[PDB]
Amino acid sequence: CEKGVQVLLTTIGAFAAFGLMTIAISTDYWLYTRALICNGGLTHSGLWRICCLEGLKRGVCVKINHFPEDTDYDHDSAEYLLRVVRASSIFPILSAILLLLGGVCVAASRVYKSKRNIILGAGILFVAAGLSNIIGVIVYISANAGKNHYSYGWSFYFGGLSFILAEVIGVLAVNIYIERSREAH
Amino acid sequence: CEKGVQVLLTTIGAFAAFGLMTIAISTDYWLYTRALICNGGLTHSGLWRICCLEGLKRGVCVKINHFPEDTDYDHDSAEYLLRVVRASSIFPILSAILLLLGGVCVAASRVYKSKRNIILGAGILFVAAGLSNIIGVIVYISANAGKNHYSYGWSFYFGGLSFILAEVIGVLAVNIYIERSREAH
Amino acid sequence: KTVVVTTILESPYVMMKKNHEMLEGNERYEGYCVDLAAEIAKHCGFKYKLTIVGDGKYGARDADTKIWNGMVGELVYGKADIAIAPLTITLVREEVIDFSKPFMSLGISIMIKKPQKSKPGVFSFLDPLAYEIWMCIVFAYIGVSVVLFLVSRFSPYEFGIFNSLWFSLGAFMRQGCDISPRSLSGRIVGGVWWFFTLIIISSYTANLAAFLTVERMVSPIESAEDLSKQTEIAYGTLDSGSTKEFFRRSKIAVFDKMWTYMRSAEPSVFVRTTAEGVARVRKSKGKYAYLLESTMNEYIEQRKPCDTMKVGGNLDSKGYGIATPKGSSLGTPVNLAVLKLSEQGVLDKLKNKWWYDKGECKTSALSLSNVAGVFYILVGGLGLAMLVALIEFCYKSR
Amino acid sequence: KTVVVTTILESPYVMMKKNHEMLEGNERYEGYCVDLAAEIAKHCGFKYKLTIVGDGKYGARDADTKIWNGMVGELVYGKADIAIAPLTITLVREEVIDFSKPFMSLGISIMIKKPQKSKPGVFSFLDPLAYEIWMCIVFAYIGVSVVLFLVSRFSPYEFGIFNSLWFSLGAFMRQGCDISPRSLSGRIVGGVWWFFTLIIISSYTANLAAFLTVERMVSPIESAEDLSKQTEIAYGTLDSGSTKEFFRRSKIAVFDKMWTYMRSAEPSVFVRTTAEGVARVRKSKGKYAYLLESTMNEYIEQRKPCDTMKVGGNLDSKGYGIATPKGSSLGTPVNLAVLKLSEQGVLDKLKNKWWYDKGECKTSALSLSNVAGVFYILVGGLGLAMLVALIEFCYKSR
Amino acid sequence: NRTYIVTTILEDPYVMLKKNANQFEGNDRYEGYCVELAAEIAKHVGYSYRLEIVSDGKYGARDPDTKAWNGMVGELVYGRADVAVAPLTITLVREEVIDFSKPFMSLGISIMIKKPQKSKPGVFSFLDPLAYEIWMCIVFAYIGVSVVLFLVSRFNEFGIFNSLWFSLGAFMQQGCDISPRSLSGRIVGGVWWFFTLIIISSYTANLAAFLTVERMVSPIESAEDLAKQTEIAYGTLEAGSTKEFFRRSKIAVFEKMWTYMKSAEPSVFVRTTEEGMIRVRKSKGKYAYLLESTMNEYIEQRKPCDTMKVGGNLDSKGYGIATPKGSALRGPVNLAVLKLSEQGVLDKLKSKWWYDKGECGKTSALSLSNVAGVFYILIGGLGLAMLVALIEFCYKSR
Amino acid sequence: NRTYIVTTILEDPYVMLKKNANQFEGNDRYEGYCVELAAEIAKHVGYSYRLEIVSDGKYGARDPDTKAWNGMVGELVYGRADVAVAPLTITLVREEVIDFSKPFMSLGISIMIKKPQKSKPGVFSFLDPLAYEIWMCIVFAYIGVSVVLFLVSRFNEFGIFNSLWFSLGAFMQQGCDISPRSLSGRIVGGVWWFFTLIIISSYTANLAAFLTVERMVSPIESAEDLAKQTEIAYGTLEAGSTKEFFRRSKIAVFEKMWTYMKSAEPSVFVRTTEEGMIRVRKSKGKYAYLLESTMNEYIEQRKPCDTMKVGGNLDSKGYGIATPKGSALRGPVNLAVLKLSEQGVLDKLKSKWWYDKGECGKTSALSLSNVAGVFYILIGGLGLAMLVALIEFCYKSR
């Protein structure tokens, strides 16, 4: 109804999105492919660590090799840059950082209400967060490409819902800034 | 400049177009194909009659067989209707008729200036003339199709210029009618 | 010691060699059956003198005089020792002579003059989509316009029915109409309509290339049924041939009806020799239709001018069989020769060489003939429009 | 009376049959050269006992002891009557024994580990058009916007430069910008620009399907030059093989440089047997590169795992030749056998059967990896835009 | 006046045990093509016939050592049975010792395979050209572009509600009620447009790639290939003429296939056609059965309907009744067979037993099924829009 | 210390008469590959050589009756010449009577054809998908639609000047500043749109059809076909080993081609390779010459450059120096040949004589040439627009 409820909705959405994105980063059920780890065998996989299942090991959560996957060619071939970014996962964590900073700026907006540009900065943060997260998805997929079945687990759609919420919040924050400016008029 | 010169331009264009179209109908240099008439040999051809050249006969202007070209199949197959229309050449002659009637209505407009719809009827006549002529071209080509070199002679482009002029005249006549209505206001 | 071979001059089963006048003996004739008979005398172990049946006939029994003509007559009447020909196997010829296991198979089939490649028809631009899709497309276009009209009336922020129809139509043809929706439901309807068009048009344009240039041979006959159901086009046979007898003795509706037709038609449908019937088809301009054994039809289709075509599946299945006089001691060996050859694979090789080795038979710019139809439509609508306006005007002036 | 045949165990020229332990005699070995030698003894008219050279070597002369190793040694040193092998012809081996006319041809060639199918690169969506066309396209887009600006200024009925650029850009991407020209010259310019786009886009989209999915093997080596110009990747040879001697004696720049490289590289590039070098390539992960005769490279490429590839045209052309001791009376007949066989066509048939008959080696949905690049661009521009606005805003607030 | 013994074999549909056969006795225990056939034959010759299955369930063949006759031929030659009415392929060896009859059905040696994945195009086949991931990330980019454009525009009619529109029109190429006037809005529009162009061109080109390319692939698809493959198993039936043909073949491919079959472990052969059928069904593409063509077709027709014939028939031969050598029954049987043929019977029975059951029943116009998911989507959007308009009507009225 | 006689033949580029040879005498009269080659050979063996052409201008062959030797082999065997340095193909018969040497160049029997129409895509190749007639009638329809729309609209912003615009945007799919509000205007718009869609879809699909399909056709393209064709002539050179190979071939295709060549009137043979060359050049696709591959390539390279090699080489053999049987010169010559090979010489000369001259020097990205006519058009329209704006500026200023 946009009589101050907008801000509380904004902040809870921001922190929920940050939570989803932190979970997704900090979780290993991004994938449900079959790999040659299980002694070939079913594997739910993640951004950081594989961890087998329905296999002999059945619970051995291994750390993955992103760049050192038998490189065998193509160092400094523009594939290395992708593999770096996937492994580092700088874009998802950037999204998380930006969501956090957006919630920070939102809360500080509730405090230093004299300044209006703060909420606008928050909106920009959320938006850039969304863009970064979609890039995170893109790199993840365009690396995972290197033809068996595969699937995406609740962590992937948590990142997806994080992006959705981030964009929504960008909208709402910008709307707040606009109302604030009109009040300033 | 549109102070009465428009009408004289209209009528001379109309009668020039009618002349071109009558020539084209009444001429046999529509084509420059090679046919099995000359004893195979070069042939300039037309809407009505072939007439060989650069051949043994070299001047024998024969009448063509449009429907009776060894029919051998396809009576009442929707090819017969095309061959009828090509042979009859009803569409080109319709264009000529309409151009004539348009010039008639133009001249009568110079006489019974009390009525304005006359010039408008003239414009419609010219326009329909153009449409009919393009159909004439289309049927001509879509029959002539039934892979040697071929070419189109000055009579074809006379029909083309006739259509151009007919459309131009439709424009000018309509413009006249509009000025006449504004004067009536 | 030598064996009087009977046969016939029917290509590609028997043909005199080029410059045969410069030759005398069995070398005069070359053909599939010549090769076969040479092999057969090789296996059996005797000598053969080839002979073309004097009557130029296959075989048949007089219904009054009960005499056997042609090669069957020669064998029954001692004139001939054996026959190695495109001779067909039937009951009647069993009852008087002994045939061998079929050395190749066949059917009774229909030969026609190759109809011309029927240029793609006017209104070809519907081919890339089935006719139930266009009907569904139209129901859908109407439905959308209706639904956008209802929505803009009941829940507005103007889309009369005609303007809604216009917007939808413009969106199908990818041309953006000037008016756009402003609400959230009309915008949805427009979005889904847009997706609809994107898919439909993408598909249609994907396959539109071939369909407007595709050239398809459709024949006025597709079976014996389409023969017995008409008399514009005739259908005849060879004379004294098993095809004739099979039709005559047939107890089936179609074949009996066609037999009745052909036993009285004037001028006579029948002929005296195959090549004569081939010519009759090749000149009758599709008013005739020959009923011969399949193999001849195939070879003739492959051989130039390649101006004839087999149509309709074989009305029956039969087989060609070497023959012998009844009680001859040549029946048992010729049989085993056929079997040995078929097992080894000679007969397939001959069938390929005499037929396939005789074989003598792109992306192209569009011709106006292809896309002419749409032009007509164009002009049509224009005419219509003109007319319409006049109506309106005549109505208003009133 | 029997002839002591020398040869070697080098596939596909000589191979022991499966379950050879269950066999004794010349039947133990099967191979191209086995077939050849059988034929040769058939033609010449003697008997042969096959023998694999004990040293497992082809032939070469000690630079100090001046002894001949392997099959050449056996022939010169009486151990062997004849050699029928993938033995190469060279001057040095002429000077001590007599070779025959080459029974097949070859070259010295480069074997590499099959590099992976390099997925189409980012910015692949430019491939369907050459790079001079995009440059010309851009010059043209600028030119059009310029010309429409000049025209709208000098001869007006508003198209600033930026708005003109916008209209042109919108017309290239088929999205109708809201502003349109109103004069007769701007309308012309727009019309021609529109035709331009229609053609360009039609072509590009016509061929865009394959280019974004095309997968191309590009190798880090394409000739001897790219070998001698690097030391990341090694290049070695068989030992006591004519390849070694040819490199050693070479007076050309490239081959001498590579000879210098390989006479001192550590660990040793050379090997003791072909299959060892095959393995070295198949494991060295492309850091090695084998220099062997072409035929082996071909067979290995066709044979599974099919994980190796021939690269670069044959540095030289040579031929494999049956051999004999100098002054032997077996030289003249073996020669004529080779000639007769090559004339009849046996050698081609063997070459096809042992190589091609050993052969053991679609429209697919787009993967995001294919079209990922454009996404990045998208986001990039978005970022840029954001930034830009901030700039403007920061400038305005100042 | 004695009933005549009739040996035969259990191979669907030639002969089969009736449902409820335990409730039946005598010649009414079995049903099948050959059942009716023998019925008419004995009707013609005017004798009584007693049905009997062959003990071994194996057709017939000869022990090379004992030189004995098994199966139906063993039954006949040694006198256990008076007549054989079953698919008893005619061949040289069998005919030496018994009296066959003119065929009644024709066939050849053919390949049977397990059906691979149908990969049938569903109703949402219009998404296949672009992976699920691309559609997802397209939606993500739509949301991104729209939110960014709102933002840069609003710190203009570029709210979020109109931005999502503008960025939905641009993707579908159906226009733009509005065009950005800012540098930032224009940068974003000019990036979405490019993204759009690439994606749409890609989708359409690959769509054309799908529609003009449907499943037209099978690996073996011939006989040479089959003889070349090694990951697959293929063999024959013991005690039949298929094994005999392969074993006695003097052809290259057939000889090699005989070599393979005679040495593959486990025994590629089986004892019953049903055994090989169940093997291929449970072979996971690892068994390819070589048998006749009649049974191949029949098996393909009946459920599971999980098999298919492949390749053209290797040879061509025929079934046939059989009798002991020198018997006095052969003549009437042959005449009966020919009568049946001319009368349209054998065709009738074949249609009844093969196609009447029907357990499972270039460019071509699109079926509505291929693209019906679009209509489902469209309908869903229509209903949703009416729902949303109801919502808006309520929200506004209050 | 005598100069050694050197017979050879005049066949470019192996040996040729120098330009201004009338101004030259002795061994400096001729130039060609084999000229230099003999130079180095005599340099190596340290003797002096005197060049001589063969009287007959025919290589060598044997009369079957007189059993005599003609050409270079006749010169050598009977002692007229001491050495032959020319393309003297090695074969069994020749080698019996003279001493060949290890080859110096490799080749085979190959087909030469007259180049068919290039059909090269010009610069206005973007119109090809639609015939000249369609473009004309499209312009006609544009004029028709625009004039009609003006009319029905004006008895609205639909003057003629804006109508031609609207009907130009619609065709290019680049938008519409205006949309008709009348029933008549809407009918016409809705017809132009449809016409547009069909035409554009057609043009684009057929464009894809062109670009993804370039010239990839040649009729003969093999040896089997050549032996199957009859509208074409093909033969050999008299007094050479190509005729010998065809005549003595024990192969099917080669045997049939020998049959054809031995009986075709007029004599398909010629006396000089040049004669057959000029025949095929002046055969109008009616002569196809079977010769070596070296000359085929060289001829293709040099102007007219109106020929092409086709098909893979039928066989594979090599040239070679020759000497009288038993001579004492063969050894040094063979060693010299091998030295030349290892040293990179023969490669050098081949490159010099074949490719150095160079009289005429799936998907692939478009060349700017393919689509440059667009840029010509665009530039023309630009200049025209500036001109028209100048006109308008004058007309307005006055």
Ligand SMILES: CCCCCC/C=C\CCCCCCCC(=O)O
């Ligand atoms: C308005 C135009 C926006 C252009 C923005 C594009 C900027 C960056 C995207 C490209 C990054 C991909 C680089 C990986 C391949 C490489 O190594 O070059």
Ligand SMILES: CCCCCC/C=C\CCCCCCCC(=O)O
């Ligand atoms: C607004 C829609 C306009 C529809 C106007 C179409 C009317 C006539 C054009 C079709 C004439 C072509 C008929 C020839 C083929 C046939 O025999 O049916």
Ligand SMILES: N[C@@H](CCC(=O)O)C(=O)O
């Ligand atoms: N061989 C067949 C030929 C019949 C036909 O050609 O129709 C016969 O003897 O009757």
Ligand SMILES: N[C@@H](CCC(=O)O)C(=O)O
């Ligand atoms: N046949 C060659 C083999 C050398 C190689 O494989 O490199 C030789 O005798 O030297």
Ligand SMILES: N[C@@H](CCC(=O)O)C(=O)O
């Ligand atoms: N019908 C075959 C048996 C089946 C087979 O061998 O494949 C025969 O009579 O020999």
Ligand SMILES: N[C@@H](CCC(=O)O)C(=O)O
């Ligand atoms: N080089 C060939 C002559 C050319 C030919 O016969 O085609 C020879 O020595 O026999």
